[PDB]
Symmetry: D2
Subunit: 216 residues, 4 copies
């Protein structure tokens, strides 16, 4: 046993902090990326150097269109974890021009987590009982407006809403396989949300599912 965490958007502002923090706790991290390959590798450099083969970068396109389906690209991201360490215990989902753009950011921000969670669960489902880890938890992040800046009020509230239903609904559907699913949002530092994430992923939080954490 050494547990494994997949942090999507792992080189972004938040994701990195979550990643540093899950790694400090003794998790092996998969550091997901699209655009930011260099920073992925810096981060992987820093952690592996601190503790060897404890981190991998992995590129994945989390957009609405990459013809390869998002459903499949998502399943492949989770697969990177199994190929490389053979388990995945933790998932953290972190003008016409403008309009089509906002609609697409809406789609992947709801649909990527959905498919990343189908995938995560499918694998746990397939792992045999004896060889399953003991503490599977999924955290959906939701963000302030400042961090979804290319936004009007309304679209943001739609995305929060679906994310909100993802969390409560999977919490339920996925309890038979012992998978907790929780959320962290604002609120009506990076170091800060990280402690929440660490607690929800910790053994302390075994009986906690369905819960939308609020922060500041």
């Amino acid at each position: 046993t050494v547990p494994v965490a997949l942090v999507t958007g792992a080189a972004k502002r938040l994701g990195s902090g979550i990643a540093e923090g899950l790694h400090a706790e003794g998790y092996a991290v998969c550091l997901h990326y699209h655009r930011s390959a260099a920073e992925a590798n810096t981060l992987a450099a820093t952690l592996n150097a601190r503790r060897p083969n404890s981190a991998i970068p992995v590129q994945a396109d989390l957009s609405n269109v990459a013809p390869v389906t998002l459903f499949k690209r998502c399943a492949d991201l989770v697969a990177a974890c199994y190929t490389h360490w053979g388990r995945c215990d933790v998932l953290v989902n972190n003008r016409e021009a403008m309009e089509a753009a906002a609609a697409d950011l809406f789609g992947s921000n709801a649909m990527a987590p959905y498919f990343l969670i189908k995938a995560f669960a499918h694998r746990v489902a397939d792992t045999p009982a004896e060889q399953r880890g003991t503490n599977y938890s999924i955290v959906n992040m939701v963000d302030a407006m400042t961090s979804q800046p290319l936004l009007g009020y309304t679209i943001y509230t739609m995305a929060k809403g679906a994310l909100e239903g993802l969390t409560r609904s999977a919490a339920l559907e996925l309890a038979p396989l012992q998978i907790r699913v929780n959320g962290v949002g604002p609120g009506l530092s990076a170091a800060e949300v990280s402690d929440v994430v660490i607690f929800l992923c910790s053994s302390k939080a075994k009986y906690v599912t369905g819960t939308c954490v609020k922060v500041d």
Copy 2:
């Protein structure tokens, strides 16, 4: 003054009833369709015959991909109403194979209403003060599971959630232009929801916005 209602999915089971009912009340209806052109025209036949030039069918593709954006296809649907009657007072939003499908049904069911509402409001915004109608209301329908049958529990709950936030958020954002926005869902006949829709669209409901109606 004779008010105008746009009922998307207007030949489907529910939509038709809503349409017959808004028309009985004295609304001129635009009967939206994609696949079901024949039934659109039967319905238009029945109402115009009952009361002349009081109904038009209009085809629109409400899918996620029809390269023409949904944003634009939506704006064009609302435009059909203005071209033909010069006003629009009422909007009613009514295997990899399987997965991409569900993701797409998710996208258009959240995003079509969003863009149908941007469009509706834009026009009202552009109409001059003197020539605006007096009672603009928008109703978002949400449906039982039986009517979104190609579904798992979770996806359905995501869509409800975004729809839910659309309704509350626009209610707010769109109150300066006097546009009420409300929802009708189940519940935790066709004739039945129709009366709710008629009331929310009626002058009786002037001070009602933000409200999610529940039914049975």
Copy 3:
């Protein structure tokens, strides 16, 4: 065989409107008051003037405090309808140092419990009526008032009270649904409101229950 409506706090302001509006639709009205005799009798006379035997005033303390229990007082008020007219089809619940604090407690409990008990009695009376002898459209409306119109309450205790009342509405809807009794609420958005009341009570709302209507 003319429907009967029980409006608590009929004597002054929102109560009167609602009673007046309901009366103008042809219910017989029972106008509860506590301290405002002039107002309840004046109003009842006016109404009885317009249509004979159509209104009565009925006195009750609905504060929270045998010396008579709140339950019994609430049961007798509901009984004053049967006695007088044979039936009761509609209930509208209008909410109305160390010293401020105990009074703010008393108020809180009074606003939650009086409706709770009223709803209990109403419903027990329905259940005692032989099956074939019941009315065809039982509905209950819980009014929530703006923070600004009940000045003795801090933000917190107000929210508490709003929370108790939403619970009762949603709870009682589910719990009474077998007796075909609908329970709904009118509250402020984020005779104005009498039309919503008329609607919820109307035969057109036969399937609306457990709804919190938002009015501003």
Copy 4:
């Protein structure tokens, strides 16, 4: 300068766990009881056994009913911490014919108001402390119990009570945020729970407030 925690209903079952758990983290604990003297003294002795001057029992009636007002009783219980230890940093609120009905009313008001008043007093004490002299981590936890563990309540009145309590949590969080006092809730999903309490009270939750944690 050792932190002090006030647990209502410490005497039996969930209360004891929580007090025990909090105590095992090194708070000084004030163990409220009403009727169960044996339980509160036994437990306090055990704890004081393990570490001297680390626990005391303190008696209070927290029912809803000068003859002493609930407010004053709640103020004095909170005062029994200052008096004894100089400070109070953590509050945990554990909820615990015609006749059943009046008792079910009394219970309801007691469960909403006792916490409300407790939170008032706690917070007044914080505010009277000169600025530079306050503790660094004030937190409040409102426990909600399962329907099954408080048998005297119908579904409806329970939901009412749950609603009052969620209101207080979310309300008091916003209202006390200027005094750097956090308010959160633990409730059932749709020493198990002591770890969540420890967490919410811990320095790692400095930015968590207004959260309803869901535990089953």
